[PDB]
Design an enzyme around this catalytic site. Structure first.
Site, mmCIF file in Angstrom:
data_model
loop_
_atom_site.group_PDB
_atom_site.id
_atom_site.type_symbol
_atom_site.label_atom_id
_atom_site.label_comp_id
_atom_site.label_asym_id
_atom_site.label_seq_id
_atom_site.Cartn_x
_atom_site.Cartn_y
_atom_site.Cartn_z
ATOM 1 N N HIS A 75 24.634 5.075 55.265
ATOM 2 C CA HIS A 75 23.639 6.139 55.110
ATOM 3 C C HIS A 75 24.109 7.428 55.779
ATOM 4 O O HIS A 75 24.892 7.419 56.724
ATOM 5 C CB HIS A 75 22.270 5.685 55.663
ATOM 6 C CG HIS A 75 22.241 5.397 57.141
ATOM 7 N ND1 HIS A 75 21.988 6.373 58.092
ATOM 8 C CD2 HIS A 75 22.378 4.233 57.824
ATOM 9 C CE1 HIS A 75 21.974 5.821 59.296
ATOM 10 N NE2 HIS A 75 22.201 4.523 59.162
ATOM 11 N N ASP A 77 21.916 10.060 56.796
ATOM 12 C CA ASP A 77 20.968 10.634 57.739
ATOM 13 C C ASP A 77 21.225 10.062 59.127
ATOM 14 O O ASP A 77 21.864 9.008 59.290
ATOM 15 C CB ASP A 77 19.516 10.366 57.278
ATOM 16 C CG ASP A 77 19.182 8.862 57.159
ATOM 17 O OD1 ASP A 77 19.961 8.118 56.519
ATOM 18 O OD2 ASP A 77 18.085 8.466 57.621
ATOM 19 N N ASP A 108 25.941 5.664 64.689
ATOM 20 C CA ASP A 108 24.998 5.240 63.663
ATOM 21 C C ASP A 108 24.734 6.377 62.657
ATOM 22 O O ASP A 108 23.810 7.174 62.852
ATOM 23 C CB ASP A 108 23.705 4.764 64.349
ATOM 24 C CG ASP A 108 22.685 4.239 63.376
ATOM 25 O OD1 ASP A 108 23.028 4.011 62.201
ATOM 26 O OD2 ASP A 108 21.513 4.076 63.783
ATOM 27 N N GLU A 142 17.887 6.429 55.273
ATOM 28 C CA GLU A 142 17.790 5.039 55.709
ATOM 29 C C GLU A 142 16.835 4.912 56.886
ATOM 30 O O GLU A 142 16.111 3.916 57.005
ATOM 31 C CB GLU A 142 19.164 4.511 56.133
ATOM 32 C CG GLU A 142 19.154 2.992 56.432
ATOM 33 C CD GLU A 142 18.818 2.666 57.870
ATOM 34 O OE1 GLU A 142 18.974 3.550 58.736
ATOM 35 O OE2 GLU A 142 18.346 1.538 58.142
ATOM 36 N N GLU A 143 16.854 5.888 57.786
ATOM 37 C CA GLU A 143 16.135 5.698 59.045
ATOM 38 C C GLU A 143 14.628 5.732 58.831
ATOM 39 O O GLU A 143 13.899 4.950 59.447
ATOM 40 C CB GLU A 143 16.549 6.745 60.087
ATOM 41 C CG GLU A 143 18.067 6.772 60.412
ATOM 42 C CD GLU A 143 18.494 5.729 61.444
ATOM 43 O OE1 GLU A 143 17.652 4.896 61.838
ATOM 44 O OE2 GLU A 143 19.673 5.769 61.871
ATOM 45 N N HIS A 356 20.749 5.751 68.620
ATOM 46 C CA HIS A 356 19.484 6.428 68.903
ATOM 47 C C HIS A 356 19.311 6.843 70.364
ATOM 48 O O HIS A 356 18.191 7.180 70.765
ATOM 49 C CB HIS A 356 18.266 5.579 68.502
ATOM 50 C CG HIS A 356 18.325 5.027 67.106
ATOM 51 N ND1 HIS A 356 17.259 4.376 66.524
ATOM 52 C CD2 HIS A 356 19.318 5.025 66.181
ATOM 53 C CE1 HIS A 356 17.590 3.997 65.300
ATOM 54 N NE2 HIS A 356 18.834 4.378 65.069
HETATM 55 ZN ZN LIG Z 1 22.222 3.072 60.723
#
Ligand SMILES: [Zn+2]
Ligand SMILES: [Zn+2]
Lengths: 383, 383
Positions: A75, A77, A108, A142-143, A356
């Site tokens: 992904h 984003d 990520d 995705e998030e 994150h």
């Molecule tokens: Zn991810």
């Protein structure tokens, strides 16, 4: 005698996409950059727009006889960086310090996505033989929502996959199963009255309390009796609550939200039916009702741990990588709703504890290694 | 051969104090107006300041031999009018339409307060014999805190009363008992964690839910087993609640507030000890605690229904007025904490359903009648 891609260019590609701030949006700028890179190496990508400014990217490279199709997905984003003063190095500057490349999305999962794209380019330029197709699926959103994963699955772009690798950060483990996720809201309607004369009213907070008591008890009984060998018990937490308007008025409104992490042994359908049953029982004999809304609903994921795809990955290493599960959802929760079965695993560069968080980074040697490992995986799986 | 006070002046006095906006404040302007009125009739009042701008007023008139002391009490604050566009007639204009005088405080309780003051003036000017003292106690801040009632009681101004009438709106009933009122807050401390990995946290909303369940059950058992002949059962409602910060985080904070209406049969001490016991039991074996705070605590009130004061009032009527109780608190919750017993009743002009509502009014003939009835009561009680 074509020239190799330099190490400095491989690192620069990842820096350039980290510098593109794609927080819940702006994925079209990431997609355009990667599509332009693929075109420099004679691979033509297909842009599949989600909404204005937000585009998915598909690309394919085929060789040899018609064979399997291996999907590589990531992904574009990233989650918000938060207070940028809290970062040691600015989250969208993609600064290098030692073996570490710092930035939001470095782990990520822009490192995995860049590694997949460069692996496809280097696979083509190496001339090495195989029989099949490798397909990139780079997704939007995705998030928050798995928006592109759902869009591409509904459209048909997953239909030809025999196998799929998702490049989320696992470091050197193979994640083959993960929990589902449900977010829900329960709203409670009552009737205001003065707290000194309450028979004229109906207390919305009390009715909501009865739901919390029963839902916690039923979800705890589910956790005590059913479990998954890898993922554990079903998880349930009420996480937000509000209600009332004045300390001396009977509350006419209250609301909560909660989160559940689900396992295949007691799937999302059954969880939602259970919550609905509790609401129905508590609404007996009253016109002041609780109401249930499902706000997020992602199914659990469980692949075959002995699939040919996993065998192809373990063949790249002297010692086998550990097979693992995880609690968080991925785009596999949408891709596995395709109307056929395919081999699946999550395997990507990155630091497993840093998604994150402040001061996110990826190790540059891990990123560069995974570019090579993906090529080896493709050549084995599509032999 | 002194001149009488004209009907138009009696009505004008009440209009003038309604036009003084005294919402949770500015009682000193009401007190000054009434003290200036008393001085025009050779009664010298005593200003007892609460805080800047907020003054209580005491005044005394004695005649005959040393006898009983009869207190007449009312408060000078009023509750907010709310959206003034919603009023038919402006809440602080004191407009007359027919037999109705409209305004915030017309019923609660500036009509009773003005009637008491004018009754004392007319009692003096009538020359009619009695043996004792009549004492006005006009208080600050009854609606939020019973601030002046508490101040005057602690200072000693209630110590000489043999009897007390509070001029709240009862219309033609005698309220001799009323409930107590408790407002409380319970705060819940927990520990944040991601909703996908909750063992690192502690859910503050769950702990608060356990308090609601147990407090409602214990308070319901109290309502089922104990009651007052006039006031009924103990009342309990949780009225406000909040908690959590994000749907996918375990909540580290939650809070509720609630209201209880109490009866003499199970007094406030015991209610607070009961809530504290529930908090203590739920805090066993954890360092994430619930905490109880009492924000408002007014005791129930119960006078002798056959007191000499009540006999003096019933002697003014051909047929006896009904004796009643009420749920709302009054300044008697503070005055009865004086270190001696006195006769007590609530009796005042006004429309019982209109306190704190839009388009509040009082009937002018009810107001003027009560000026006469208070004089008759004084002459009987102090005979
Ligand atoms: Zn991810
Ligand atoms: Zn009042």
């Amino acid at each position: 005698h074509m020239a190799s891609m330099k190490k400095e260019e491989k690192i620069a590609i990842l820096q350039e996409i980290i510098r593109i701030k794609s927080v819940n949006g702006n994925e079209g700028e990431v997609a355009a950059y990667l599509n332009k890179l693929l075109a420099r190496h004679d691979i033509t990508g297909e842009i599949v727009s989600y909404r204005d400014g937000r585009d998915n990217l598909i690309a394919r490279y085929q060789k040899g006889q018609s064979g399997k199709v291996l999907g590589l997905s990531g992904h574009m984003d990233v989650v918000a960086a938060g207070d940028e003063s809290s970062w040691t190095y600015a989250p969208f500057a993609a600064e290098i310090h030692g073996n570490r490349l710092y930035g939001r999305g470095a782990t990520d999962m822009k490192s995995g996505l860049a590694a997949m794209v460069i692996a496809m380019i280097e696979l083509k330029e190496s001339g090495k033989p195989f029989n099949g197709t490798v397909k990139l699926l780079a997704t939007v959103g995705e998030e928050v929502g798995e928006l592109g994963g759902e869009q591409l699955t509904k459209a048909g772009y997953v239909d030809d996959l025999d196998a799929l690798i998702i490049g989320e950060p696992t470091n050197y483990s193979l994640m083959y199963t993960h929990m589902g996720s449900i977010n829900y809201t329960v709203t409670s309607h009552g009737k205001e009255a003065h707290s000194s004369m309450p028979d004229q009213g109906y207390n919305a907070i009390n009715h909501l309390n009865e739901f919390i008591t029963k839902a916690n008890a039923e979800m705890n009984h589910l956790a005590e009796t059913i479990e998954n060998p890898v993922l554990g018990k079903t998880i349930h937490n009420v996480t937000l609550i509000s209600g009332g308007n004045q300390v001396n008025s009977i509350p006419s409104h209250a609301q909560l939200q909660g989160n559940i992490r689900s396992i295949p042994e007691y799937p999302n359908d059954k969880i939602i039916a259970l919550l609905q049953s509790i609401v129905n029982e508590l609404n007996q004999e009253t016109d002041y009702h609780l109401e249930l809304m499902i706000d997020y609903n992602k199914i659990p994921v469980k692949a075959d741990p002995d699939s040919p795809l996993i065998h192809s990955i373990q063949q790249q290493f002297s010692q086998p990588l550990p097979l693992v599960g995880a609690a968080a959802t991925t785009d596999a929760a949408e891709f596995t709703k395709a109307n056929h079965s395919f081999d699946f695993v999550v395997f990507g560069p990155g630091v497993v504890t840093l998604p994150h968080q402040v001061d996110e980074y990826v190790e540059i040697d891990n990123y560069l290694d995974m570019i090579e490992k993906y090529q080896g995986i493709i050549l084995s799986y599509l032999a």
